[PDB]
């Protein structure tokens, strides 16, 4: 990957809420030596959200005691008593290697988050795991993980949300050590499944109003919805979360944007948040990937994106996405191609593997319009991004690679007005990925794609009528 974060070696997994110290974002992420094997937390820092400097393990795997996901916060006021400005993290670990004993352990750092000391006793104990007995009780006790810490400024206390089976649990604390159980968050459509890597935060909308957001990684493939990040805007009163609407909204419609996490931007923490996710899906994450053989590592994170909350007619709010601004600093070349009308297919006179391409497509009677990236000259390999019916789809099927096929998870789709006869696309292509930001960023589709060395072409196509492709600009991306 030219511009996506990958671990120096080994298996990469869930990212953890970055903390800002030493004038940089300290990113933690699950890492193991063996694919899908036991591991812990590794450290990487970034000052712009594009380039990462890896620092190794901070919270190591220990005999039958792996470190699972959680989150880290900067205790500025020294509320926990480990010193002002100390970095405190909570993470789930299976006590005694027992799955039904998974609970929250606290780790702390007094050097900006480069070295951590473990607090021997868990701050939030899995009591269900000790009293469980029936098959249901066990299953319930075996889903008590991924704590996300947030400072409820209005109440002057800490609030933590923990993922569970089809519901979320909440705890409050004045020192990050002593927690008090609160009211759970329940939602009606369990076919949405989930509640892994929950997220809880406050953000100011474009109208100046303050809002709470509760989100989590889901699995709604069964009912035709994403397996990415779903969120509920609302409010937290100190006892429970009140969702404005129980039907969640989605942050990504692609195949690979899992365990995503968000964090305040250094420049505008109240209105602009940054977000990153693991580019994988458990439907197939447990396997070898091309990079295992070529470079001895498995997994990459998504591009970092910026998030803002925008008011919608009727008083509701939605999130908007856009690639992190600094990526502009890694552009090594900018190519513009002439507008053109296509009726059938046309190959563009450009080739590459790491770049961002923007374009506008307008049509009338065509029942299908789109663009192919990672197109091999033999014409057999390519990933298609286009508009059909009420879908803005991304079909990676033709890019399936022998030995690493992603079938049958080929055609991803985001909703788009059926009446749309024009669309703007912003597409980020790298050696093992494709990320599509549609129109104003309300919908995004992120997917890993195993491109072959020669999958460098780009073509345009339409079915049932001509289309006008304009504003074509290709920005090549390297390192700089
Ligand atoms: O089994 C989940 C289901 O049970 C409910 C009952 O209302 O809550 C159970 C759950 O609440 C806790 O006290 C807090 O996390 C747990 O100890 C207990 O298992 C529902 O809220 C939930 O849907
Ligand atoms: O659903 C859109 C899609 O399927 C329709 C159709 O169009 C063709 C030919 O252009 O493939 C291109 C894309 O159009 C495909 O990747 C999308 O899923 C044709 O092969 C396919 O039957």
Q: Domains plus CATH for the chain? A: 1-326 (2.115.10.20), 327-480 (2.60.120.560)
Ligand positioned closest to the Cα atom of 412: 2
Quote the DSSP letter at residue 62.
B
Structure tokens at 437: 């930001």
Tokens of 326: 């600094």
Q: Give the residue from 232, 158, 159 showing the smallest Cα distance to 195.
A: 232
Angstrom distance (rounded) from CA 107 to CA 115: 10
Burial 350-370 (b: 16+ CB within 10 A, else e): eebbbbbbebebbbeebebbb
Q: Are 176 and 79 in contact (CB under 8 A)?
A: yes
- Is 72:88 a contact under the CB 8 Å cutoff? yes
Which of 184, 187, 193, 246 to probe ligand 1 with, by most ligand atoms within 8 A of CB?
A: 184
Alpha carbons 113 and 22: distance in angstroms, whole number: 9
Q: Is there an atom of ligand 2 within 6 Å of 412 CB?
A: no
Tell the residue nearest (CA) to atom 17 of ligand 2: 395
**What are the structure tokens assigned to 395, written together?**
């079909």
Nearest-atom number in ligand 2 for the CA of 345 is 10
Question: Please, where are the H alpha helices in 206-285?
Answer: none
Tell which residue, 437, 299, 255, 310, has the closest CA to residue 4. Answer: 299
Nearest-CA residue for ligand 2 atom 19 is: 463
Closest ligand relative to 371 C-alpha: 2
Task: Indicate which atom in ligand 1 lies nearest the CA of residue 169.
Answer: 15
CA of 184 to the centre of ligand 1 (A): 7
The residues, any chain, with a CB within 8 Å of residue 154's CB and separated by 6 or more, are none
CA distances (Å), origin 106, targets 70, 390, 403: 10, 47, 41
Assess whether the previous peptide bond of 408 is cis (omega < 30° from 0): yes
User: Vertex 187, ends 185 and 193: CA angle to 5°?
Assistant: 110
- Would the CB of 459 count as within 6 Å of ligand 2? no
Strand order in the sheet with 70-75: 70-75, 86-94, 102-109, 117-118
Residue 295 three-state SS: helix
Report yes or no: 14 and 29 within 8 Å, Cβ to Cβ: yes
Per DSSP, helices labelled H in 46-123 are none
210 CA to middle of ligand 1, Å?
29
Rounded CA separation 220/95 (Å): 30
H-only helix segments in 73-202? 127-131, 135-141
Helix, strand, coil percent content, the chain, rounded in steps of 5: 10, 50, 40
Pocket of ligand 1 contains residue 240 by CB under 6 Å: no
Q: How far is the CA of 131 from the centre of ligand 1 (A)?
A: 14
Cβ of residue 186 lying under 6 Å from some atom of ligand 1: yes
Distance CA(105)–CA(400), nearest Å, equals 41
Name the method of structure determination.
X-ray
Residue with CA nearest ligand 1 atom 6: 184
Question: Is any ligand 2 atom within 6 A of the Cβ of residue 368?
Answer: yes
The closest alpha carbon to 59, from 98, 25, 28, belongs to: 28
What residues are annotated to the active site?
Answer: 14
**Rounded to whole angstroms, what are the CA distances from 42 to 9, 28, 104, 180, 245?**
11, 5, 18, 29, 36
Q: What's the 165 CA to ligand 1 centre distance in angstroms? A: 9
Tokens of 282: 């458990």
Residue 386 CA: which ligand is closest? 2
In Å, how far are 203, 388, 438, 440 from 359, measured between CA atoms? 31, 17, 10, 13
The gap from C-alpha 173 to its chain's centroid, in whole angstroms, comes to 27
Residue whose CB lies within 8 A of the most ligand 2 atoms, among 363, 383, 384, for a mutation test: 384
Maximum separation of any 2 CA atoms in the chain, in Å: 69
Distance 467 CA to ligand 2 centre (A): 16
If you count them, how many residues does the chain have? 480
Query: What does each C-alpha distance from 414 to 177, 388, 445 come to in angstroms?
Result: 42, 11, 7
Whether the Cβ atoms of residue 392 and residue 413 lie closer than 8 Å to each other: yes
User: How many angstroms does the Cα of residue 383 sit away from the middle of ligand 2?
Assistant: 11
Say if CB 435 and CB 6 are below 8 A apart.
Answer: no
């Amino acid at each position: 990957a030219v511009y996506h974060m990958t671990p120096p070696s080994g298996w990469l997994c869930d990212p953890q809420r970055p903390v800002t110290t030493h004038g940089a974002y300290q990113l933690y992420y699950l890492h193991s030596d063996q694919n899908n094997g036991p591991g812990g937390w590794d450290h990487a820092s970034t000052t712009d959200g594009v380039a990462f400097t890896h620092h190794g393990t901070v919270m190591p795997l220990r005999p039958d005691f792996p470190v699972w996901s959680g989150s880290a916060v900067v205790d500025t006021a020294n509320t926990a008593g480990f010193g002002a400005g100390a970095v405190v993290a909570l993470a789930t670990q299976p006590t005694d290697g027992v799955r039904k004993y998974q609970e929250q352990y606290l780790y702390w750092s007094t050097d900006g988050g480069f070295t951590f000391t473990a607090l021997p006793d868990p701050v939030i104990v899995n009591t269900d795991g000790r009293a469980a007995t029936t098959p249901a009780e066990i299953e319930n006790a075996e889903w008590f993980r991924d704590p996300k810490i947030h400072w409820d400024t209005a109440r002057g206390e800490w609030v933590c949300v923990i993922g569970r089976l089809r519901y979320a649990a909440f705890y409050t604390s004045p020192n990050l050590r002593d927690w008090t159980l609160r009211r759970n968050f329940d939602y009606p459509n369990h076919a949405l499944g989930g509640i892994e890597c929950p997220d809880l935060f406050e953000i100011t909308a474009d109208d100046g109003t303050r809002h709470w957001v509760l989100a989590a990684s889901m699995d709604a493939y069964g009912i035709g919805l994403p397996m990415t990040y779903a969120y509920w805007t609302g409010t937290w009163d100190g006892e429970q979360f009140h969702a404005d609407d129980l039907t969640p909204q989605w942050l990504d419609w692609g195949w690979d944007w899992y365990a995503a996490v968000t964090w305040p931007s250094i420049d505008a923490p109240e209105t602009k948040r940054l977000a990153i996710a693991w580019m994988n899906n458990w439907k197939y994450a447990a396997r070898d990937v091309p990079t295992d053989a070529s470079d001895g590592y498995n997994g990459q994170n998504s591009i970092v994106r910026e998030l803002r909350l925008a008011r919608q007619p009727g008083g509701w709010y939605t999130l908007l996405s856009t690639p992190v601004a600094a990526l502009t600093n890694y552009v090594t070349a900018t190519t513009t191609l002439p507008d053109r009308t296509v009726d059938g297919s046309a190959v563009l006179p450009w080739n590459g593997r790491a770049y961002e391409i923007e374009l506008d497509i307008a049509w009338d009677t065509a029942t299908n319009v789109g663009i192919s990236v990672g197109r091999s000259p033999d014409g057999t390999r390519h990933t298609n991004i286009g508009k059909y019916g009420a879908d803005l789809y991304v079909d990676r099927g033709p890019s399936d690679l022998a030995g690493y096929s992603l079938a049958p998870y080929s055609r991803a789709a985001a909703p788009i007005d059926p009446g749309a006869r024009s669309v703007h696309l912003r597409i980020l292509v790298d050696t093992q990925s494709v990320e599509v930001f549609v129109n104003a960023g309300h919908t995004v589709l992120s997917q890993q794609v195993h491109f072959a060395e020669g999958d460098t072409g780009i073509s345009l196509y339409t079915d049932g009528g001509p289309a006008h492709f304009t504003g074509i600009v290709v920005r090549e991306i390297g390192q700089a």
